[model samples]
Target chain A: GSHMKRFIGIRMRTITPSLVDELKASNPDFVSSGIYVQEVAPNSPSQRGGIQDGDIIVKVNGRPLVDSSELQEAVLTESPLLLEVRRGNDDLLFSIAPEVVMGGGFGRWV
Target chain B: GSHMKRFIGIRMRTITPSLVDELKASNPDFVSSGIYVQEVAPNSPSQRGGIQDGDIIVKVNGRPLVDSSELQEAVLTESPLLLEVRRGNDDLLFSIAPEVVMGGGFGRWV
Candidate 1:
């Protein structure tokens, strides 16, 4: 069996100045305002991996999470993905393995 | 007091695969290793910044720290620099104001 792509299950919102203003208490440093996790898929990799709603994804695999495609790309190829997140004032790391999908491209699986 | 090029009091080490292997327990995601904080000067911006040695600085001013020069460029311009770091197994944010140094190239401080 060949693994074509990986999917994880989370909806994210790119942090913007207006969003920051609206959520003053959750005022994230706009300069490094990554993306906010708006929703987590039920029984998905994210939910099982301990990711929660309202958590901000700062970096995907250590790189700044500028775009949703960044997280998509990371999960698309990697088995276990590392994420840096901000939960209120606490920052944490989450290592999640996405569900592998078949029947797409010729990918070597182990 | 005059504000010239901002200066932080922290030294960094570029993460390499060898270092990663040696610190397998701390085997950071090499794909986005960024740069590790090797040293922090006493009473300096980095010290007050609450940065500690062994903390891997993942981003500088929201951008990935690919090179020491990346951080250097950030400090050279920004006043309140935002740093994203990996401390042990935790990911954290540090906001440090680089000390204002007198004399830009050749200017009056008044």
Candidate 2:
């Protein structure tokens, strides 16, 4: 019953330089990495698409998310969101649907 | 007879922090400004699209071009290039054709 940004429901934060240094042992190739996923909502697009809790999102639709706003903009604007992710030594791609039906018996945006 | 990346033949450089400050009077909204044009090629897409020298290309296809590579990538990837510019408080939009026949009687990339 409140106004909220109900996109994929995955919570992430921009990667810091310290975080980059901390992850260098596992991810040596990325410099100035993208956002880091901290949590995923149940039944959200991220969870359904199999985006993990600690996944690092590197690119969306083959382009890097330049700033904080871009991630939200991409999620809002793009349909079938193409995500390039890094999970330790594993490089993965996930195509995320942008919308889904909510359990509240109404339509919701992903 | 040279292996060169030829797109719209626009010569641009990434805007520096000092440049952003200098242009702040005319373009106050832009915190991190975009690439500044130095030259445009003859009969090129940029010239035909009415893009002039000293123009600042702030966005491509409705999204801010984050880096120098994004500009080049947009030129190469997008069929119809959309440019957002700031020319002394006048916001400009240009739709550019991405390809044309060269003087050498061969097709060239925009």
Candidate 3:
């Protein structure tokens, strides 16, 4: 069951003005708190990375996950994955595996 | 010429995996080297920012232009534009003006 996108861009929905105002108070850069993981087709590297649904990443490497594009770039270029997961203050680290995606579309890894 | 987007995300075409390997030699996050200015409505903040077509941003604040998403986040939330531009090895800083946008769209400032 390894059908994860090697690397591709993800679309984001707006966060609303009122909500934006509130978030701006503290996290002037409170972008998206988590990332979206598209369905991984069978035999994809995403399946090997252990990225699953409902996983809210709190940090990437050591920096806060403020920009989704950074994550995507890392996936595309960098090797090794040092992801910090926070599920209710319980931080866990994972070593993600990488596989080259082939047969590209608008923005597909493979 | 005052129709710059208040703050919106930018799309990045991949740098090719072969190129990606070279970029990883130094800055692993060489996403987009510049920011794009969309058409700003009349009396828009973008016009005030002095951003022109063909203005390639080399740095933001004091950080290198690594993530396009970070630039969009700063434009939307942060006040003041401390843009470091490189028009051929000559780096220049610019102070951008901000104005509240109006009329809603998918990701409009207003």
Candidate 4:
């Protein structure tokens, strides 16, 4: 019961061209979209930093995130991360210290 | 972006006998121990019915849940389910209409 799976504990939606158009149609200021935060696991590193749904992630560490796989690569490196998020009118900085939890199975290295 | 993954959207922890003993020590009323809900995805089948973390799931569709695999099998059937959960002081009945979402990869029977 002690051994468990490792993950970043976040579900996200990739920003495609059509999605960008939809977001832009709804809100003109919806620019620089990368990944949309769909859900944050409770008590996970993501939640500990106050990441919430509807938040658009613009950058991870100092690189622009264009694909979901990029986020996975960053998390797999196993280090503290800095995320830049756009919430309505302000851009916020959040830091997460990687942590692992028991249960669930991951496809890649866990 | 439309082609996505399918899952019940609930992460669980198995309740071993040792866990039962631990629960009993912490709370005398921890009688029915099954799988513990660790995370519920937002807007997924599990979350739409108000499922929350820290909820001890005792039964699925009237069948007792003893292992994590049982829960996975039940969800894979793609049928409606009635979950019996033990909250702090009350046992509640939750109705979940299984739904799927994009993103994330499931090991079996997506």
Candidate 5:
């Protein structure tokens, strides 16, 4: 089977790779210069917390981010989040919770 | 309905979240403190090029990568990749082609 269905609580928005470079270069504490975006699923943790695309996150629960893994780790480790983000000239903090997606994965057949 | 299917060529491995932190800390060029492990699929690009688990990705097509977005952008922009990797003490080079897995997504019905 080539087709399949699954539920996931992630949203994706595309950004040019170089924008990530510019941000990383500017932030000294940024560990792994990479893109860290919230997959803006409706009613999901990120969306409920008012996280949006283009928001550059610098810290999560006081942990400085170095790469996407940091964010993912934080999400998997902590159910609800205390997030601090940088969006343009503004720094915003929010308390958020995750909405788990039930099922999403690969198809069975070849 | 809370399930769906999708066809993607990426592989997933569970890393102890903290391992990513150590890698970025050790490498000056490592941009994002993130995990960059291969999601191995049969005949997929990374597999075709002989990439494996525990392989720490340092560069993609000769570019010094700071984050996953850089890697993702590199893949999206360039059809095939000329990859340089770090596995333990070895520095390796690879050229890979994308497999383009088809079909997989969300379930319908309220």
Candidate 6:
């Protein structure tokens, strides 16, 4: 059993064109964008680390999130994960402790 | 400029154990999990397609989201992204049109 697997407890989707149009119209000062936040589980590492709903995650551990695979590598391989998020017109930083768990369905698409 | 880069306008984080504990306690009927959504741009492909705040994405294009890298591959490589989400106690499906954009920051961690 991979009980030692670590997770951050969040879900996301890609950044498509229509979304950009909306953001530019609603928040003209919107900072750089990336993946969109769909949800954050209660008491999860992300919540504890100050990640909220509707925050754009721009970078993971200092690396730009160019694609989902790059983000996955950083999240699964790094600890004390550093995240750069775009909320409104500000770019905020957060540090999350990806804790180890005894399950497989904790941080994946099931 | 990679204006032709397609984006979905969503961001995500991984799922950790503490999140699972809280979800199991509150929802009890939680389903499989994947990356956590942090934000959704307005009118973006995700928003138009029905992705919302606090939904756990379980699969993409019928592929299980085992990690972040896999999610990236699916998002960047495929079209008409298919998503399976877990909300409250129900599993939902969504079809998103990932559109091409006229900028780099439109879909990356900037």
Query: Considering only N, C-alpha and C atoms within 3 Å, which residue pairs clash in candidate 1?
Result: none
Better of 4 and 5 by DockQ: 4
Best by DockQ: 4
Tens digit of lDDT per residue, candidate 1, span B1-110?
55454567665656776556756665545334777665454446877768887788888778888667677778777768789998767889999887774533211100
TM-score of each prediction? 0.42, 0.41, 0.32, 0.77, 0.36, 0.46
Return the lDDT, model 3, position B22: 44
Q: Can you write out model 4's per-residue Cα lDDT over A16-103, one digit (the tens) per residue?
A: 7766776778778645558777667665788878888667778888899887777777776746778888887879998876775544
Which of 1 and 6 is the better model by TM-score?
A: 6
Please give, as one word, the docking class of candidate 3. Answer: incorrect
Error of 4 at A37 (Å): 0.9
Clashes of 2: 3
By summed lDDT, which 10 consecutive residues of candidate 3 chain A come out lowest? Answer: A101-110
Writing each residue's lDDT as its tens digit, candidate 3 over B1-110 gives 33344542222223345434544575544333454332222233444555443345666677766545666667677667688764434556877644443442222110
RMSD of 5: 19.0
Evaluated on CA atoms against the true complex, candidate 6 attains a DockQ of 0.07
| TM-score for chain B of all predictions | 0.78, 0.73, 0.52, 0.74, 0.60, 0.78
TM-score of 4: 0.77
Runs of candidate 4 with Cα error greater than 4 angstroms are: A1-4, A102-110, B1-4, B31-33, B102-110
Q: For residues A1-89, what per-residue lDDT tens digits would candidate 5 score against the true structure?
A: 33323322333222345556655677645423323453343434565567775566677687776555556666666756677777667
Give interface RMSD, every candidate, in order.
22.3, 20.6, 13.3, 6.9, 12.5, 9.1
The top-ranked prediction according to TM-score is 4
Looking at model 1, what is the TM-score of chain A?
0.77
Clashing pairs in 4: none
Residue-level lDDT of model 2, residues B22-106, one tens digit each, is 6777656653678777556454678778988668889988989756677878876776878998766578999876754333222
